[PDB]
Amino acid sequence: ELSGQPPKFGGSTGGLLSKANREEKYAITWTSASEQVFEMPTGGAAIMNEGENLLYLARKEQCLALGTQLRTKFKPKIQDYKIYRVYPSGEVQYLHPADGVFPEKVNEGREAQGTKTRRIGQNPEPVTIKFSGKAPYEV
């Protein structure tokens, strides 16, 4: 299961809506050396506990903005946060960083997806692929 103490927060109107219990929510866990104040991505300030911290947010982008704040706005840089997607059935899917290494650094075992062996200007004409249901960049 997901472990960590929730950061102490007074509550806000910017948090979870019915999409969290209906479709999906997201979780971010991080270890903290001390007790200091961070900015909620839903507006306001929260206090993160010493040790493990588990925060529930509405979008993946909110978790990643929090992770960017953790890496960039703290003098001991918190570089070990994990972002998960949580489904209402209870299944937790690990998202970020997917291979244990931040994606700006290369890692072996990463497969090239979305890569094109042609240049941007050598995509074929749309008139060559009419009534096929596929765009010039998908062929």
Partner: protein, 154 residues
């Protein structure tokens, strides 16, 4: 402590606040005992009570401000406007219920099923036109209601 503003149901990350408007004891005991939320109610009774209140008050605006307000058929025009508005509202309620509960039926609220929402819409119809006609019958024989309240006949 003394802080009356808390997290909504003890979760500070749900986008709501426990306020004296949203989560006071009066708020819970009033809203949760309104017919739409009152525990143990059949949905037809919920719809019936909601419709009676709504059809009763919807008599008023066309009665006092409509185009027939300066004729001899002022209460008539108020009643016809209220009945037609209740008819449109019932059609909207039933179409919402047909659209919303197409698939699987939940095991929680009986109101939030196709069966329960259809029962609620039926109750809303019956109550709306009942409340509209009872408010019209009070207004059309308003002289009798006045004489009753003043003891003029007795």
């Amino acid at each position: 402590s003394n802080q009356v503003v808390q997290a909504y149901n003890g979760d500070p990350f749900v986008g709501h606040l426990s306020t004296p408007i949203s989560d006071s004891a009066f708020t819970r005991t009033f809203i949760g005992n309104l017919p739409a939320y009152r525990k143990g109610l059949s949905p037809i009774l919920r719809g019936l009570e909601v419709g009676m209140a709504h059809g009763y008050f919807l008599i008023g605006p066309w009665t006092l401000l409509g185009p027939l307000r300066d004729s001899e058929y002022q209460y008539i025009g108020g009643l016809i406007g209220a009945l037609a508005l209740i008819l449109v509202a019932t059609a909207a309620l039933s179409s919402y219920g047909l659209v919303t509960f197409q698939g699987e039926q939940g095991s929680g609220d009986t109101l939030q099923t196709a069966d329960g929402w259809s029962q609620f819409a039926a109750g809303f119809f019956v109550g709306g036109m009942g409340g509209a006609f009872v408010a019209y019958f009070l207004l059309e024989n308003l002289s009798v209601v006045d004489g009753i309240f003043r003891g003029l006949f007795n």
